[PDB]
Every structure is written in C-alpha cells, then in structure tokens.
RNA sequence: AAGGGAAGCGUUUGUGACCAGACUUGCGCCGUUCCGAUCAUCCGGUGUUCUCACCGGUGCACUCGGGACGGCUCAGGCCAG
RNA sequence: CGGGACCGAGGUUCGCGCAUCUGCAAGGAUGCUGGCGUAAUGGUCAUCAACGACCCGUCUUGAAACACGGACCAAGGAGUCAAGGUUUUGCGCGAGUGUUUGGGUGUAAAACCCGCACGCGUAAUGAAAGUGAACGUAGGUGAGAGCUUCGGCGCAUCAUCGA
RNA sequence: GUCCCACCCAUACCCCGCCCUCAGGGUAGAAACGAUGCCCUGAGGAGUAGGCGGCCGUGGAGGUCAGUGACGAAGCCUAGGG
C-alpha cells in the first residue's frame, strides 16, 4: 500500500509543476520552479595534494 | 548472502524488495497517456519571448 | 522416510529376516565423510533453435568430415543437435547428426512433401547411431571399409526416394547440392547474404 | 532509485552490509517508519524528517 | 590418557580386533581398563554392532571413529593384490626396449 | 586416494632468488631482502625482481597439498606409518632417508596393507 | 638468555638499531655526570632539583646507634599481645587482669598516637612517648611507664 | 587509495591473560562461557579483571572490605585480587568474601568469625550472575612507583634519590637561599 | 648449446632435451564353489544390558561369511564442444 | 529482445520471495557429448623472440655517477658480561619479605633442613635541638563501573572544600 | 586557433577469486575441542631511520620418540622432484 501511495505521489508532484508552469504562461506571469532540495556529490580527484 | 543479485536485472530479487513492481507493469503506470486538446500559449507570450 | 522391506525366507523352519538391501550395515565404514554437495537450482529447459532452422532448409556444413558440403535439414532434436541428410545419391552425405553451431542456415528450402515423419522418429530417437559402436571397433589390422548396417542402408534408401524426387524439380538444385562450398578471393562472409 | 537498488549498502554495526531484503532496513531504520526499500528511496528523493 | 571416558581400538595379536575402554576413577589407577577382544572369525557387521553398543554408553561422539577404526583395521588385515605393472615413458621406454 | 579438493592454484610457480645472486659466486641463491638505501629491487622499480610477500600465499584448503592431493608425512618406522591408518585419504607416507634397505621393504609392505600412499616407494 | 634479544632481531639490518645518521659513537656528550651545569643542565634542573649546592652543618663522627629509636603507633599496640591473650581483652571479657607490654622487648623505643584504642586498660613500658600517645592511653584507662 | 588516518588499529585492552597458570585458564574459560551466555554485566567485568596484570589488581585488606560493607551486609563481597589481613582491625565481623587469593592470616580470621572465604569458581556456582554482590577494587594509585610518575617542576612528586638526608637533593632548586625554589 | 661494439636479469610464448604426478580401478545390488549365522543354554566381565569364552547354530538357487567367474547402477584421470 | 567476453567462489535441509495445488530463474553450475589415457595437459632447464631492466654497499637535500670500498673463492668476523638503578610482564608470600655470611646433613661443588642478627617496607618533617599524623560511619560536594528490596547504595579513579 | 564524434591504456575506479592483518558475532545439564580450535561477517594492505610480534637455522644441556644407522650415520656433488 505504501508503494501505491508513493507511485501516486511521484506522479502527482510532477504534473503540478507542469500545470503551474502552463498556467503561468496563460496568465502572462512567471512561476519560479522552486530551488532543488537534494543533491548528489561525487568525488573525482584522488587523495593526493590537498 | 554469498552473491549479491541486482534487482534491476534479476526479476525475482526485485519482487522480494518491491512487491508493487508486478502491479506497476500490468497496470502500465509508466505509460499513462494524457488526452484532451492542449492549451497553447497566446500571441502575447510570443512577441515577448522574441524581444 | 522409510523404505525397509523386511522379508522372511524359510531356511527350514520359518524364521530369519534378511532385511532390505539399503538397510544393513555397510560392511565398510569410511574414516571421513564425503563432501555431500548442496542442492543445485538449475532445471533443464528445452533448447530453442534459431528462427532460420526450419526443417527442409539447405545447410552448409562448416566442419567435421563433410565440411563445405550442402545438406538438407530433417529435424532439430535437442541441445543444438540437428538431424540432416544431404541425399546420399546426390553428395554422399548419409543420415547424420550435426551440431547446429557448425552449420550455416541458407535461404533455400526443399519441400519435404513425401517424407514420412513416422520414419523421422525411431532414428531421431537416440542410441540409433552409436548402438553397435562398442561392439564393432576392431582395429587389429589389408584395411577394409566398415560395412554399413543393412538396417541403416534401407532407412536412407527409403527417405531418399521422396527427397530426391522433390529436389530434381528445381532447375539447378540437384547440381547445387552435389557441389561443395568454398571461399574465393573477395568473398567477405560478414557481407555475403545467404 | 537505481543507485540504492544496485549500489546501496547499509551501515550495520560499523559494517558494510548489502541491502538484499527488507529485514536490514526494518531492523535499523524501523524507529523512523522506514521499513522497506521504497520507504528508504522515498525518504531520500523527497527530503523527509528522517 | 586425558579423558575419564576413553575408547581404544587396536589390532588383535592373531588377526582380531581389541576394544579397550576406561573404567570409573581411572585418574588414580592405570590398570582400570575394560578390554574385550573380538575374534578374527567374527562377522564384520556383528563387530560393528558390538562396538556400537559399548561406545554409545560412554561418549556417542566417538561412534563414527570407533566404528570406522574397526573397519580400517579389518580392511588392512585382508589379502592384498600385489600391484599393477608399471608403464615406462620416454627414455625409460627407449632404454628398456634397447636393453631387451 | 586424495579424497576431494578445490583445484590447486599456485599464484607463482617460480620462486624468489636473491638480488645479484647470478652475477656473484659468493652470494647465495636463497632469498635475502635488499636493505640498501638505493637498491632498485627494494624500491620496486619496473623490470626488476619481485619480493616475497603475503598475497602470494597459497589457498588454505590446498596449502600443503602435493599435486596428487595428499600431504607429506615423514615416516621412519612401521610404527610411524601406522599413525596414518585413519588418514590415508589426506596424508601420504614419505620414507625418510637413513632408513636401511630392509626397513624400507617393511614400510612398503605395511603401507600397502593400510592402502597408504608412499611418495618414494 | 640471549635468544630473547633485539640483537638476534637486528641480524641483517645495517645500523643495528642505532641509525644511519647520528650513528652509535663512543661518548657523545661526556662520560658520567659530565656537564651537569653546562649541557646536561636541562636534565638536572628538570629531574634533580637540589643537586648542586651545600645545605646544613656537618657531623664529624656521626654514630647512627645514637639515633636509634624505632617507633610504634598505638594502632598496633595490641598486636604485641599474643593471639590467645589478645582475644579475651578485645572481645569484652572484663576481668581483673591488665597486660604489660614493655615495648623495648619487641624492638621499639618511642610510642606515637596514630590510630585508636579499645577502652581496655593496658600498661606500656616505653623509653619515649608523644603527647597524643599518652593522652589516648590515659583515656583508655592505661598507664605509661617511662623506662631507660 | 582511500583517505584514512589510521590503518589496522588494535584494541588497547588485554584480551587474554599472560599467565601460564593452568587453574587460571580454567577460571577464564568458565567466565568466558558465563559472560557470553548471560545478560549479567557483572560477569563481563569479572572476566575483564581476570585478564588484568598484577599492578592492576592491587591487594585489598579486610578493613577496607569492612569499611565498604555497611549497610551492604547480606551481600557477597567480590574481589578479583588478593585479600590481605589488617592488624589494625581488632575484630572481624561475619562476612562473605569471594576472591582470587586469601593470605593465610586473612583466610583464618574471616573463617574464624563465621564467614565464608570462597573462590571465584565457587562464587559462580551459587551466584552465576552476581545477584547480591559487592564488586570492590583495591587502591590502584597506592603503589610506590606511581609516586614517581609525572615528575617535573612544581609537580610535588617523589624524586629518584638513593638516600634520605640533608644532602643529595636539598640545595639549589629546593630553597630560595640557594638560587631558586623548583 | 649460443654469439653484428658487453653479459647477466623481469613478464610472456614458441622450439628442443629431460621429468614428477595422475590414470590401471573401487564401493554397492542380482546370478556359482567352500566355511559358520538367528536363537538358547553354561562360566566369566560390564556403562545393568551389551559382550567374550564351550555348545547345541546344520546350512544348493534357504540364513551368515568368504574367492573363483558374469550383468547393472554410481564414482573415478587429461583436454575440450 | 538479441550478439560477444570473463568468472562457477560455496557444499545435507533451514532463509527472503514468486507461482499454485506442479513447482521455480528465489541464501554462488548443472546436464548432455566427444577425443586421449599418454609425455597429450603440466613442470624444469637451454635457446630464440616481443616488451622492459644503469652497479652493489655507504655518506648525502640529492649516486648509475667523472663520490669512496669492492679481482675471485673458502674459513674467521662486530650491542657481550658484571655490579647498581628504573619501568613493564610472569611467579611466591604478603605487614611482612629474603634459607644458602654461617651451622646440620648428604647419593658429596647438587639436593634438603636451621636460626640469630641484618637489608628493604611499615612515619614523616626540620640545618639542628627536636617534634611526630581521627571533630566526624577516616569528612562534605560532583562524576562514577557494578549491585539494587527500584528508594537507593555506590569500588577504583578524577575535580573541589575541609580535618 | 576553435568546435565536434570515435577509439588506446596506470599498480587509479567497479565486480569476482585467493593471502594476511584488524575488528565484530556464534559454539557445553557438551553427540565434545591442537576452544591457543572451528564457523560467519566487514574493512584495510606503500615505506627509509625506528619500534614490536611470530616463525626458520647453528654449537651444547635435561626429558622424550622402546627414534635412524656398517643390509651404510655425518659430509659432499646433482640445468632430478615435492
Ligand atoms: Mg562474497
Ligand atoms: Mg628497516
Ligand atoms: Mg653506520
Ligand atoms: Mg643518536
Ligand atoms: Mg648531525
Ligand atoms: Mg588498497
Ligand atoms: Mg668486432
Ligand atoms: Mg616449454
Ligand atoms: Mg546483453
Ligand atoms: Mg612439454
Ligand atoms: Mg608444454
Ligand atoms: Mg631472451
Ligand atoms: Mg629500455
Ligand atoms: Mg651489508
Ligand atoms: Mg654534497
Ligand atoms: Mg658526472
Ligand atoms: Mg670518504
Ligand atoms: Mg678500488
Ligand atoms: Mg640468613
Ligand atoms: Mg625484618
Ligand atoms: Mg575525599
Ligand atoms: Mg572476530
Ligand atoms: Mg649417506
């Protein structure tokens, strides 16, 4: 059941961003897509000379 | 676990970890269509996008 | 589980038991236990031949004694083993088993209308070819050809009757099968169509 | 999703333990309502309280 | 010598099997040994049963070893096929052929 | 004999010889670790000798197994070879030198009865 | 035992544990207490304060038998009584007897009042006694006998 | 390569006694089993103290046992060490003491008072979990060597002097009349 | 055996000489020829119910054991599809 | 859903799962087939070939050095012992401890036994004359492993105010 | 000079096998073990001066293997083997 909710939750969040963007275009205003909250870091430069 | 099996490639291992994987495939949740006539931008949105 | 069968032989007066074979002491006991392997989760599934291995197609033998020859596919048996015969009166290839990985499946198909599938069986059934190999392996010495079993001679003769008649109805198929396949200069197999 | 399913290992008693079934996640992150891989993935993608 | 319940199987003088076990309080008395000598003509299966009866009471963790050792002693006492003829390779074959 | 084992894989079948043991006759072939301050072998330069280390160690399951599958046990008596009565599947008799011709025959005779392998019959 | 030594462990390594630079020389720094005021001053000032100088007056023919006066703290007075006798006094068997110790027989001269005493009266014959040792004996009901 | 500051760091605590005492080996085997197969934190501490050396198991006197045993009477005093006798204790009450060792004077006096002088293997019999026990440690820093540790200026520690007198360390760095004070 | 202003050495093949192993069969079930097994008595030991001593076991497709010759299953060396 | 490559560790059942009255691809390879059964695989050595490879020890910031020692081989060749300290480890006894200067005895340079003194420790501090360690459950406060009759007691040790 | 695709390979990164070190668990009304053992899991591995641990070898002493040996000990030679 929790997987059901999450799959639906992911589905609905993406459409709201699209719907908000499209409705802003119709109105003529601008919608800020909100800053990202999660980032993934990758270290790619060794362990020497730091 | 002597040998890690990838759920992304082993279907049986995927099912022990996510029982909703089977329902996702049959219900075609990854291929949901959106219908209806799209609402295009007005002529004011353009001619503002280009100066 | 239990599998004891405690019989009772007579020996004059009705006594004595003589327990079942797999119930008595071993009469020899090892100093160390055997490895006793674990259970294996590998169940045999039938071999899936290629899409082009339709029975009646002409194949090119790439190895073995009859390499380069062209034969007709009769039936795919199992585990990659094919039953083929390039008619013995055409190119001299008897009824023979060939592994499906050492052939080329061409686009030429010979109609098998006239060949009984009943006789295709009982020769696709195994042990047919190597029935008397161990019995006949004399090599103690003017060499002479190992005479072919009269049963197999008759079997090949029966199949060839229908097969050759159908083959001869094509203008060049009879000569095409009688020839052998070779690579000339400029023939690139990766580019050659079959 | 693909990072956690394929290269996702847990930290159990200062040991790197492969996440092959939900028991490891249940017995470690159970106090926070995360009992399965989908719960773990949802808590990462959507920045949750835990 | 260490354990207070010990089992010992040794070959018999005249081709039998001898089983020796420790009695109670043997830590103070060395000669407190209960020894039984099965004959050479006794059935192999019966000898295993007789030893299995005794070892089970004391230890039952030496059931395999006591029975197997009796089997090993019995195996060594039977007749022996001498050997198979040893083939020679390379120079040894050439040397033998040239010599003979 | 040689009941059962994993294949005997040897990580290195050659051995390690001492640095410059081939150029100088006073320097033995037995390995000694180069302790010089400028030595190229000790510094692991490319194209030089390798030094022994763990990592070249043999598998524990097959560490001291001869290619047949047995482990060698040195035997010098008929009473010594009887110790392997219960281990004839994992140990092989090896009659040491100094054993006279007569005593060698008895050890072969007895080890044949025990079905114990003798590596120098 | 020589087989338990670093010497058997340094066989093969050049410097034998003493270093390539700054090698093991003969006497780099002096022989003995050399330079106690000049270059070994940082060791003496740190670990041996009071080493240099002169304190007090002299005593030309000091005989240490004059200064002989072993002490006995009253917390161990009753240990000089034998085990069988000490039982009845300590246990509380009040009676008409009182022990006499005569410390000098046990090799003691002065008596000092460190510990405590049971209220049993006791007689002690001592060469010297302290103020508190006498006070704690009197309170227990004892008697001090000064002897020579 | 991985950026670590330490590699293959070992545990700093002893994991098995260095003693070749065969009887002590049996005692450790018993308390290895007990500490593993019980939830008693008392068993773990007793196992750990059996490993310790002789300077980490200082002797205890009956007087120090008596001092701590109030009002903890009806409890078994457990000392992983040696229990010594005190002359300054004129009477010994009835006590239950379990210890690795007892001096002959201490064992006789405890038993004469009507108490129990038992060993740690006896203790594990009636008290497999330290149900009513008083775990007591002797004075660790009462050793003579500890008086010398950390010597330095203004540390008030004991110097390494081979004699006591007006000489050998009393002049300079010990009084302001000769240079300075420490 | 090798050798166009050094040689030696490491990784890896090819070639030539030499050589150690492994393998030869073994365990099971059913078919021929000779000996003592189930059980009970009588001493003596013993973990108090197991066994050794003598003795009735009487035995050709019946027991027990052993060799002789045949059949079948399983396992078994090296290289591979 | 195809084409290819490398790998098959583990060794009675147990588990997580999927399917359904079968079982499975789900806690690590099985099945079928063929040649040979010996120098065929394999190993050692010699040699050729591809790629690579400066002469060791030493002092030095830096040695292949146009820095020094080294023609070659065998044998010999360098952190030892005593006294006195100290820290740590093991052991015996433990407010004591140490027989062996000496005596008795002996299977006779051994082993065994004996005791008075003495050494160190149990009391320190003063230059010395000298004096010489409990107000108190040998104290109060904070932390504290462990125990708990669940309210508390609290070893060692540390910090602090005292006697 | 700039831009774009494809490809080559370090002892680096990923997966797997094996060695060792370190760390964390299990194993007795013992059918039970060189418990100084065995089983399971994870991480790590350069090194002069230096420190520590375990092992190999030599000359002797006590105990033991009822040890080997003139039917051949010790030594020595051996592009023969493990
Ligand atoms: Mg693994
Ligand atoms: Mg070094
Ligand atoms: Mg030097
Ligand atoms: Mg220096
Ligand atoms: Mg300098
Ligand atoms: Mg690394
Ligand atoms: Mg020239
Ligand atoms: Mg070769
Ligand atoms: Mg693919
Ligand atoms: Mg070869
Ligand atoms: Mg070869
Ligand atoms: Mg070359
Ligand atoms: Mg080069
Ligand atoms: Mg040197
Ligand atoms: Mg310079
Ligand atoms: Mg130059
Ligand atoms: Mg110079
Ligand atoms: Mg010169
Ligand atoms: Mg004396
Ligand atoms: Mg004294
Ligand atoms: Mg205080
Ligand atoms: Mg561990
Ligand atoms: Mg000789």
PDB file of C-alpha atoms (C1' of nucleotides) and ligand atoms in Angstrom, chain J residues 96-98 118-121, ligand 20:
ATOM      1  C1'   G J  96      55.693  -8.525  56.150  1.00  0.00           C
ATOM      2  C1'   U J  97      59.503 -10.451  52.968  1.00  0.00           C
ATOM      3  C1'   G J  98      64.634 -12.522  51.796  1.00  0.00           C
ATOM      4  C1'   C J 118      70.692  -7.765  59.196  1.00  0.00           C
ATOM      5  C1'   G J 119      68.750  -5.333  54.401  1.00  0.00           C
ATOM      6  C1'   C J 120      64.230  -3.221  52.359  1.00  0.00           C
ATOM      7  C1'   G J 121      58.983  -1.866  53.963  1.00  0.00           C
TER       8        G J 121
HETATM    9 MG1  LIG L  20      62.959  -7.683  59.429  1.00  0.00          MG
END
